[PDB]
Design a protein around this ligand. Structure first.
Ligand SMILES: *[C@@H]1O[C@H](CO)[C@@H](O[C@@H]2O[C@H](CO)[C@@H](O[C@@H]3O[C@H](CO[C@H]4O[C@H](CO)[C@@H](O)[C@H](O)[C@@H]4O)[C@@H](O)[C@H](O[C@H]4O[C@H](CO)[C@@H](O)[C@H](O)[C@@H]4O)[C@@H]3O)[C@H](O)[C@H]2NC(C)=O)[C@H](O)[C@H]1NC(C)=O
Ligand SMILES: *[C@@H]1O[C@H](CO)[C@@H](O[C@@H]2O[C@H](CO)[C@@H](O[C@@H]3O[C@H](CO[C@H]4O[C@H](CO)[C@@H](O)[C@H](O)[C@@H]4O)[C@@H](O)[C@H](O[C@H]4O[C@H](CO)[C@@H](O)[C@H](O)[C@@H]4O)[C@@H]3O)[C@H](O)[C@H]2NC(C)=O)[C@H](O)[C@H]1NC(C)=O
Ligand SMILES: *[C@@H]1O[C@H](CO)[C@@H](O[C@@H]2O[C@H](CO)[C@@H](O)[C@H](O)[C@H]2NC(C)=O)[C@H](O)[C@H]1NC(C)=O
Ligand SMILES: *[C@@H]1O[C@H](CO)[C@@H](O[C@@H]2O[C@H](CO)[C@@H](O)[C@H](O)[C@H]2NC(C)=O)[C@H](O)[C@H]1NC(C)=O
Ligand SMILES: *[C@@H]1O[C@H](CO)[C@@H](O)[C@H](O)[C@H]1NC(C)=O
Ligand SMILES: *[C@@H]1O[C@H](CO)[C@@H](O)[C@H](O)[C@H]1NC(C)=O
Ligand SMILES: *[C@@H]1O[C@H](CO)[C@@H](O)[C@H](O)[C@H]1NC(C)=O
Ligand SMILES: *[C@@H]1O[C@H](CO)[C@@H](O)[C@H](O)[C@H]1NC(C)=O
Lengths: 403, 56, 63
């Protein structure tokens, strides 16, 4: 049914399944052969020595076209899909490819498949914004320093586990073609086992858009057969999937009373306990405000939740139905509580129908509705005469003593 | 066809709507059918008695 | 044990499993699936708390 609720319909963490992300999408690039139609030659190793083949590139030739869809299409390990770059290019020059997503994610696998040899110097980037800002992630080179001013295989300090490392590992060829690059950010991080309570790591995994720029007789180029990257849609554990909008926009169907396309905030009128992340121990859900059926808008202050022993901090605004309070939970000046009615009755508040003569004042005990009884008068609305007290038709003093 | 009255809990001077017009009891500078908005020349105030007030 | 703890629920008669009809009083009483009919709340003296049922046959009653 809904994994957001237990066998007993208890709200529990519901998550989209782990899936490849870079599968079938388009990418804007900065360079490609074939315009005008380009050529390219290909070397192969035979036994001990080398031998060079050669081919051509026209995109207008479908069979000689090799679009970036070849990176996102299904790559058959027996029918590869190699996109190709222009040749005769090297550092220092930006070989930049972008991908703007629009949604923040957590990633586990970043797999690759190469048709060209593995170069020496390169780095990783990302954008937690929508294609405007860009930050690196790691570097990769034998000379991480002379190229990037970086160390090779640095250590990950616990106090900054968000360090960006560089290595010469797997910068070698072989593998020339079919290079397999898989990256787990979790490697080396000491606080990766308890990722559920690693917000900086839960921030280190945050990424929306991706950019890749390269630095480092014959025609040399770069080519690649496919790309796969695994992840889950970031709904903070508050939505089991992500769906399209009426204006074509992929958003979480944020369950667990959460708001924001990523379930990042609480739902409107849900301000009593702070927004929290669904944990294996507790789904740390949001909660609406309590008005006992007597308000539609509310606000919150932490000090309320603070002094609540961290239990509640909700407070309603504009208490209707002659009700009032943090929970719109009492009759204002002017009514009393109709105790006979339930504690949330929309008309639980009614005018102090005090005997306009027999009651001394115009109010009544908001709890008891006890009107102000005059000298010898008693009773809630103060109507009755007492023992030995004779009612008089005086519009001022009805009950009169006996000798 | 009948729904409970939604009188503005503050800007209306009562919770009873004018069953014909549904007009809640608008207080001096309060406007709106449920008597919620402040009028032009009345700004919303955090005072729990005078929400809408003229300006000099 | 020694202190108090208060749970809380709701009643829709249109919810069959959450309804609490007087049939809960006439149905078979399972000590493991009891049938709690429920009254309205916020009620006390002085008020008539009356429930009705006629017979159609005169009887002598013991238990
Ligand atoms: C980039 O990649 C593309 C795709 O592979 C290559 O495109 C060329 O495409 C044209 C068709 O647009 C191919 O031309 C073919 O050869 C004919 C030669 O002229 C004869 O035409 C007819 C017989 O077809 C005779 O009756 C006539 O007397 C000529 O002797 C062309 O005329 C034909 O193309 C015609 O067809 C298209 C529609 O298909 C029409 O819009 C035009 O009128 C066009 O003239 C025929 O299709 C050609 O084979 C392709 N070249 C290749 C494969 O190398 C580009 O060439 C490639 N870029 C480069 C630089 O090579
Ligand atoms: C009393 O206790 C019961 C049991 O717990 C609660 O049950 C509710 O029952 C209602 C029945 O109407 C449920 O309402 C459900 O939502 C629909 C929303 O409208 C959509 O309708 C269809 C999809 O159902 C769409 O195609 C359409 O475009 C709308 O988007 C209702 O319309 C449905 O009820 C409708 O169905 C009946 C026939 O079955 C029709 O005659 C009516 O037109 C009726 O509108 C649909 O069933 C609701 O889901 C239940 N809530 C639960 C189980 O929590 C009651 O809520 C409870 N009452 C109170 C006051 O607490
Ligand atoms: C090559 O380097 C970077 C990207 O790797 C680009 O940075 C430019 O920096 C200058 C400095 O003032 C800015 O004026 C440009 O607007 C930046 N370009 C951007 C942001 O695209 C530089 O442009 C790249 N050169 C290219 C792409 O030709
Ligand atoms: C509550 O009290 C009794 C039943 O416990 C009902 O008695 C009424 O007494 C007055 C006094 O003359 C009669 O006029 C009414 O006709 C009686 N009601 C009957 C017989 O139903 C009284 O009505 C009860 N009130 C309720 C049930 O609302
Ligand atoms: C690979 O797929 C393309 C797609 O049309 C097809 O034309 C080609 O024949 C395939 N090659 C092999 C060896 O199956
Ligand atoms: C209302 O009545 C109760 C009943 O004893 C009394 O204690 C209280 O002082 C009265 N006034 C209130 C609650 O304002
Ligand atoms: C309801 O609105 C009409 C519209 O002018 C007004 O005349 C009337 O006094 C209002 N109150 C009623 C009908 O109780
Ligand atoms: C009690 O009986 C009802 C009959 O419908 C059933 O739905 C319910 O599950 C039973 N109780 C338990 C604990 O299974």
């Amino acid at each position: 049914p809904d994994p957001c609720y237990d066998e007993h319909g208890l709200p529990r963490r519901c998550i989209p399944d782990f899936v490849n992300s870079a599968f079938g999408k388009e990418v804007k690039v900065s360079s490609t052969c074939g315009k005008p139609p380009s050529r390219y030659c290909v070397v192969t190793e035979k036994g001990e020595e080398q031998v060079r083949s050669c081919h051509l590139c026209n995109a207008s030739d479908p069979k000689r076209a090799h679009p970036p869809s070849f990176l996102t299409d299904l790559n058959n390990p027996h029918n590869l899909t190699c996109w190709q770059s222009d040749s005769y290019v090297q550092y220092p020059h930006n070989v930049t490819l972008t991908l703007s997503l629009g949604k923040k994610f957590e990633v586990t696998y970043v797999s690759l498949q190469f048709c060209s040899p593995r170069p020496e110097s390169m780095a990783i980037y990302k954008s937690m914004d929508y294609g405007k800002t860009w930050v690196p992630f790691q570097f990769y080179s034998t000379q991480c320093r002379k190229m990037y001013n970086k160390p090779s295989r640095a250590a990950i300090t616990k106090q900054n586990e968000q360090e960006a490392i560089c290595t010469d590992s797997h910068t070698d060829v072989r593998p020339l073609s079919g290079g397999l690059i898989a990256f787990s950010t979790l490697d080396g991080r000491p606080t990766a086992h308890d990722f559920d309570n690693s917000p900086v790591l839960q921030d280190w995994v945050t990424a929306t858009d991706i950019k890749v720029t390269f630095s480092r007789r014959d025609s040399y180029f770069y080519a690649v057969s496919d790309l796969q990257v695994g992840g889950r849609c970031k709904c903070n554990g508050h939505a089991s999937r992500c769906v399209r909008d009426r204006d074509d926009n992929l958003v979480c169907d944020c369950k667990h009373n959460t708001a924001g396309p990523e379930c990042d905030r609480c739902k409107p009128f849900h301000y009593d306990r702070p927004w929290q992340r669904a944990t294996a121990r507790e789904a740390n859900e949001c909660v609406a405000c309590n008005c006992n059926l007597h308000a539609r808008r509310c606000r919150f202050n932490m000090e309320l939740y603070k002094l609540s022993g961290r239990k509640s901090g909700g407070v309603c605004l504009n208490c209707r139905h002659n009700t009032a309070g943090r929970h719109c939970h009492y009759c204002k000046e002017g009514f009393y509580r109709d105790l006979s009615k339930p504690i949330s009755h929309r008309k639980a508040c009614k005018e102090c129908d005090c005997h306009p003569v027999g009651a001394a004042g115009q109010t009544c005990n908001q709890t008891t509705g006890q009107c102000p009884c005059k000298d010898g008068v008693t009773g809630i609305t103060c109507n009755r005469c007492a023992k030995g007290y004779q009612q008089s038709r005086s519009p001022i003093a009805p009950c009169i003593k006996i000798p």
